[PDB]
Enzyme design. Structure first.
Site, mmCIF file in Angstrom:
data_model
loop_
_atom_site.group_PDB
_atom_site.id
_atom_site.type_symbol
_atom_site.label_atom_id
_atom_site.label_comp_id
_atom_site.label_asym_id
_atom_site.label_seq_id
_atom_site.Cartn_x
_atom_site.Cartn_y
_atom_site.Cartn_z
ATOM 1 N N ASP A 87 0.834 -1.216 0.000
ATOM 2 C CA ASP A 87 0.000 0.000 0.000
ATOM 3 C C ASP A 87 0.870 1.267 0.000
ATOM 4 O OD1 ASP A 87 -2.575 1.076 -0.290
ATOM 5 O OD2 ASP A 87 -3.067 1.023 1.835
ATOM 6 N N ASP A 101 -0.598 2.289 8.117
ATOM 7 C CA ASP A 101 -1.571 1.439 7.401
ATOM 8 C C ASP A 101 -0.974 0.144 6.826
ATOM 9 O OD1 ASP A 101 -3.799 0.379 6.206
ATOM 10 O OD2 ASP A 101 -4.458 2.309 5.322
ATOM 11 N N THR A 126 -3.960 0.855 -4.358
ATOM 12 C CA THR A 126 -4.553 2.010 -5.031
ATOM 13 C C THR A 126 -4.198 2.028 -6.527
ATOM 14 O OG1 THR A 126 -3.993 3.031 -2.931
ATOM 15 C CG2 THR A 126 -4.935 4.451 -4.662
ATOM 16 N N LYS A 162 1.972 4.797 -0.933
ATOM 17 C CA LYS A 162 1.413 6.001 -1.556
ATOM 18 C C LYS A 162 1.651 7.160 -0.582
ATOM 19 C CE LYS A 162 -3.191 4.765 0.218
ATOM 20 N NZ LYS A 162 -4.616 4.554 -0.286
ATOM 21 N N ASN A 220 0.092 7.453 3.041
ATOM 22 C CA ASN A 220 0.443 6.513 4.080
ATOM 23 C C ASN A 220 1.803 6.806 4.690
ATOM 24 O OD1 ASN A 220 -2.012 5.130 4.022
ATOM 25 N ND2 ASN A 220 -1.224 3.390 2.777
HETATM 26 O O1 LIG Z 1 -3.013 5.431 10.132
HETATM 27 C C1 LIG Z 1 -3.373 6.525 9.763
HETATM 28 N N1 LIG Z 1 -4.146 6.661 8.617
HETATM 29 C C2 LIG Z 1 -4.458 5.407 7.894
HETATM 30 C C3 LIG Z 1 -5.882 5.300 7.307
HETATM 31 O O2 LIG Z 1 -6.771 4.894 8.372
HETATM 32 C C4 LIG Z 1 -8.194 4.822 8.128
HETATM 33 C C5 LIG Z 1 -8.495 3.447 7.512
HETATM 34 C C6 LIG Z 1 -9.571 2.739 8.317
HETATM 35 O O3 LIG Z 1 -9.772 1.429 7.815
HETATM 36 C C7 LIG Z 1 -8.795 5.964 7.327
HETATM 37 C C8 LIG Z 1 -7.895 6.405 6.179
HETATM 38 C C9 LIG Z 1 -6.435 6.566 6.636
HETATM 39 O O4 LIG Z 1 -5.627 6.979 5.524
HETATM 40 N N2 LIG Z 1 -3.128 7.700 10.456
HETATM 41 C C10 LIG Z 1 -2.299 7.924 11.579
HETATM 42 C C11 LIG Z 1 -1.575 6.916 12.201
HETATM 43 C C12 LIG Z 1 -0.676 7.169 13.222
HETATM 44 C C13 LIG Z 1 -0.451 8.465 13.642
HETATM 45 C C14 LIG Z 1 -1.164 9.477 13.056
HETATM 46 C C15 LIG Z 1 -2.066 9.221 12.018
#
Ligand code: A1JEI
Length: 339
Positions: free
Chosen positions: A155, A173, A190, A157, A160
């Site tokens: 993944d 992620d 993606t 991109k 992330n």
């Molecule tokens: O992990 C993080 N984002 C990952 C994705 O999580 C969600 C998926 C739910 O299934 C929504 C879309 C998002 O891009 N943020 C994150 C992680 C650690 C510290 C600060 C921020």
């Protein structure tokens, strides 16, 4: 060098011990105050939380079990938690707690207040080649680590890649990450970052991560991805042709590295030849990179994000704030027994 070989042998030893005995049930929801939604998708969200007794801030990923089952993501979410609780590397976001309840799965990670690389790239327009090279070197080292453990990431991109308080990358992620000896077959990722062998429904391997690195480097240096188009099916046609036009401001060394990463024949692609990752680390485009200094975080970063403290959310954007419901009855208990 023997020092790199022994580093990677110890890394694999430590991963396998945690892989074979995973940790479970190390907090619960009412140990935390909810602050703000940082991101949202079709089966989960990520929220900024504060631990009530210590005061520490975390990013809490909340997945709805019934939605995970309907979108056929059971195995993927089990992969994500088992890998995250077993890895340890400077450029990977750290899992601090996990638990489940009648309705949801929870993964509580360190909070990174600098935001997503995506936001900074779109604000600035494009990164200079030295700036793109600093981030790319961190991804090369992280993939060298993950691949040595037989893990594929799947993944990559800009959304992330989080930027931390020192200006270094933390990859987040692991929803598509998987332990794979050999080949695997699932369609996931993606569209703009997918390798040709994924689009063609072939059995594929770790070479798809090195293709995605070529996409990321191109996007960082140009400001847009190489196979851009309006609908996925049009993106897919460009990818399997692999016809790539380069901006004239790219250096000759950058164009040469990208032709070898964006190689449609996976048996000729850099990262997947006899010399493995060393064909990438020894390429002319990386001639100024001190690989050990990057790993040790001793290089001054090109850019430090602007933020006020460890609870600042100003580098993330605004979402409708929804309830975190926990049903009075247990849902999908069997399917998530090992979580
Ligand atoms: O992990 C993080 N984002 C990952 C994705 O999580 C969600 C998926 C739910 O299934 C929504 C879309 C998002 O891009 N943020 C994150 C992680 C650690 C510290 C600060 C921020």
């Amino acid at each position: 060098q023997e020092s790199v070989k022994e580093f990677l042998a110890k890394a694999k030893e430590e991963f396998l011990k945690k892989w074979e005995s995973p940790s479970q049930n190390t907090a619960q929801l009412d140990h935390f105050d909810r602050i703000k939604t940082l991101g949202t998708g079709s089966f989960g969200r990520v929220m900024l939380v504060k631990h009530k007794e210590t005061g520490n801030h975390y990013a809490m990923k909340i997945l709805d079990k019934q939605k995970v089952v309907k979108l056929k993501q059971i195995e993927h979410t089990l992969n994500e938690k088992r890998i995250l609780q077993a890895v340890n590397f400077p450029f990977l976001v750290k899992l601090e707690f996990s638990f489940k309840d009648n309705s949801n799965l929870y993964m509580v990670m360190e909070y990174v207040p600098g935001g997503e690389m995506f936001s900074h790239l779109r604000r600035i327009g494009r990164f200079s080649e030295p700036h793109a090279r600093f981030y790319a070197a961190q991804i090369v080292l992280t993939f060298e680590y993950l691949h040595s453990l037989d893990l594929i990431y799947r993944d990559l991109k800009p959304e992330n890649l989080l930027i931390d308080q020192q200006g270094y990358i933390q990859v987040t992620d692991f929803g598509f990450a998987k332990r794979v000896k050999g080949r695997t077959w699932t369609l996931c990722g993606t569209p703009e970052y997918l390798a040709p062998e994924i689009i063609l429904s072939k059995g594929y391997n770790k070479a798809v991560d090195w293709w995605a690195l070529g996409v990321l480097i191109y996007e960082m240096a140009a400001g847009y991805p190489p196979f851009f188009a309006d609908q996925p099916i049009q993106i897919y046609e460009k990818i399997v042709s692999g016809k790539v036009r380069f901006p004239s401001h790219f250096s000759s060394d950058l164009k040469d590295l990208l032709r070898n990463l964006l190689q449609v024949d996976l048996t000729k692609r850099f990262g997947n030849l006899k010399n493995g990752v060393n064909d990438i680390k020894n390429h002319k485009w990386f001639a100024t990179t001190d690989w050990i200094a990057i790993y040790q975080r001793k290089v001054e970063a090109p850019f430090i994000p602007k933020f006020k403290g460890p609870g600042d959310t100003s580098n993330f954007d605004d979402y409708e704030e929804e309830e975190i419901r926990v049903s009075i009855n247990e849902k999908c208990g069997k399917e998530f027994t090992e979580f």
